[PDB]
Amino acid sequence: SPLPWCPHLVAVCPIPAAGLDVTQPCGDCGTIQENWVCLSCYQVYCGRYINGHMLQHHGNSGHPLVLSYIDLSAWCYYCQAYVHHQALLDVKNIAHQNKFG
C-alpha cells in the first residue's frame, strides 16, 4: 504494497469507545456481505461489488478513508489506493481483535 502515507490520513477520526463490530450490516441495504467502515464517522456501508453504498457515502460526505471488514485493508477514495500507516494501526488492531479474537 500500500501507499505508506496519503494526504487524507488527517481525516481519520478517533475510534468510538464502543469499538467496532466487524459483523455490522450495511447501513443502507442491510447486507452482511463485503462491508467497510468509514474512518471519519464510523458508519458501515457495503462494497462496490454488492450495492456500492460506501462509494455513495464517500460521494455524499467526502470522507476519504474506509476499512474493509473482509481483509482490514484501508482504501482512500481520493488517492484511489490502499494506504497503510502507523495512524491506521489502532483501528486495524481493534477490528482484528473483534474479527478473530
Ligand SMILES: O=C(O)CCc1nc2cc(Cl)ccc2s1
Ligand atoms: O468497494 C468500495 O467502495 C470501497 C473500497 C474500494 N474501492 C476500490 C476500487 C478499486 Cl478500483 C479497487 C479497490 C478498491 S477498495
Ligand SMILES: [Zn+2]
Ligand atoms: Zn449496502
Ligand SMILES: [Zn+2]
Ligand atoms: Zn463517513
Ligand SMILES: [Zn+2]
Ligand atoms: Zn488519500
